[PDB]
Amino acid sequence: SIENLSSNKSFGGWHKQYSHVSNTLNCAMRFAIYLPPQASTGAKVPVLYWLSGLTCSDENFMQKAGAQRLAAELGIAIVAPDTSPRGEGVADDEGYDLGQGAGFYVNATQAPWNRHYQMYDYVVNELPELIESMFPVSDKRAIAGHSMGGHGALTIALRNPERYQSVSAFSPINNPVNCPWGQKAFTAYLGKDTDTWREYDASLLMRAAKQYVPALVDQGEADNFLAEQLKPEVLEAAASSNNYPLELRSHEGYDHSYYFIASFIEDHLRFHSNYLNA
């Protein structure tokens, strides 16, 4: 029902990969965890959930973001789920932008996708329950992500404000109802009635937010997807309009890659630590 697949010592702590049978997705799922050195002492540690973007697995961030150094110092565990259901019986598309690697963190209502594409319930309900049951962790959590995963973090935090201390993102999809990535995925997973899409749009949620989760967003100015897919100005406008605690930082010359993420991940860890320690 749960299997440790791999272990690698990392900055006096541990990077470990698991597979488990998901009740919400009705499929096997892989996730990775980083436990800091403090978890070896008897301490319970807080958890940063990291959600990845299109095509990614539970490996990309663990390998490339360089988060382990500071997570170790600050005593933060990081949990990185995969980006979609995977395996036998799970629908898929040949394109990188739909199906596997592309769950969009929604609960799909349209067949065939509705059978397995319940990534919102997985991230919000099943995964944290599992993590808290297995690992030496507290009930204090935060959430972050990149692009589709930034969309994931923001939308989940805004709809579950009591559940998350803080939220952050790199290159988030802010207004997915108004971009091709969001439109393709939402039409396929949720159908043609865009009223059903509203609860999955960070910019729309933020404008209407009744309770604040502190937020930090970093955007590379040389990100090729900025205008068409990401639309940070649209998030800023929502924040402005709702007195929302959003710090949105634009960085000249930086792109959409993990090189950009690695460049500011320590900022994100110090930001989360501020709220996870409270």
Instruction: Give the binding range for Cl ion (CB under 5 A) out of 51-59, 133-141, 164-172, 188-196.
Output: 51-59
Annotated catalytic, 147?
Answer: yes
Q: Does 124 bind Cl ion (CB under 5 A)?
A: no
Annotated catalytic, 19?
Answer: no
Instruction: Give the binding range for Cl ion (CB under 5 A) out of 22-30, 45-53, 77-85, 245-253.
Output: 45-53
Q: Does 179 bind Cl ion (CB under 5 A)?
A: no
**Active-site pick, 52, 146, 223, 268:** 223
Q: How far is the CB of 40 from Cl ion (least distance, A)?
A: 34
Taking the least distance from each CB to Cl ion, the nearer of 39 and 201 is 201
Taking the least distance from each CB to Cl ion, the nearer of 10 and 229 is 229
- As given in the structure block, the two tokens for residue 278 are 């409270």
Taking the least distance from each CB to Cl ion, the nearer of 147 and 273 is 147
Taking the least distance from each CB to Cl ion, the nearer of 25 and 102 is 102
Q: Does 148 bind Cl ion (CB under 5 A)?
A: yes
User: Locate tokens 């989760």: which residue?
Assistant: 213
Among positions 29, 32, 35, 54, the unique one binding Cl ion when judged by CB under 5 A: 54
Q: How far is the CB of 99 from Cl ion (least distance, A)?
A: 14
User: Locate tokens 């005593």: which residue?
Assistant: 75
**Active-site pick, 22, 52, 57, 147:** 147
Q: Does 53 bind Cl ion (CB under 5 A)?
A: yes
Among positions 147, 166, 175, 219, the unique one binding Cl ion when judged by CB under 5 A: 147
Do residues 263 and 249 lie in contact, with contact meaning Cβ atoms separated by under 8 Å?
no
Annotated catalytic, 121?
Answer: no
**Active-site pick, 256, 268, 272, 273:** 256
Q: Does 81 bind Cl ion (CB under 5 A)?
A: no
Taking the least distance from each CB to Cl ion, the nearer of 13 and 53 is 53
* CA-closest candidate to residue 97, choices 6, 225, 209: 225
- Report d(CA 213, CA 53) in Å as an integer: 22
Do residues 55 and 96 lie in contact, with contact meaning Cβ atoms separated by under 8 Å?
yes
Q: Which of residues 212-231 bind Cl ion (CB under 5 A)?
A: none
- Report d(CA 75, CA 272) in Å as an integer: 11
Instruction: Give the binding range for Cl ion (CB under 5 A) out of 53-61, 127-135, 160-168, 185-193.
Output: 53-61
Element (DSSP H or E) covering residue 262? helix 258-276
What is the spatial order of strands in the sheet that 27-35 belongs to?
Answer: 2-10, 13-22, 27-35, 77-81, 45-51, 137-146, 167-170, 215-220, 246-251
- The DSSP secondary structure of 71-125, one letter per residue, reads HHHHT-EEEEE-SS--STT----SSTTSSTT--TT-B--STTGGGT-BHHHIIII
Strand 246-251 relative to strand 215-220, pairing: parallel
Positions that interact with Cl ion (CB under 5 A): 53-54, 147-148
Catalytic residues: 147, 223, 256
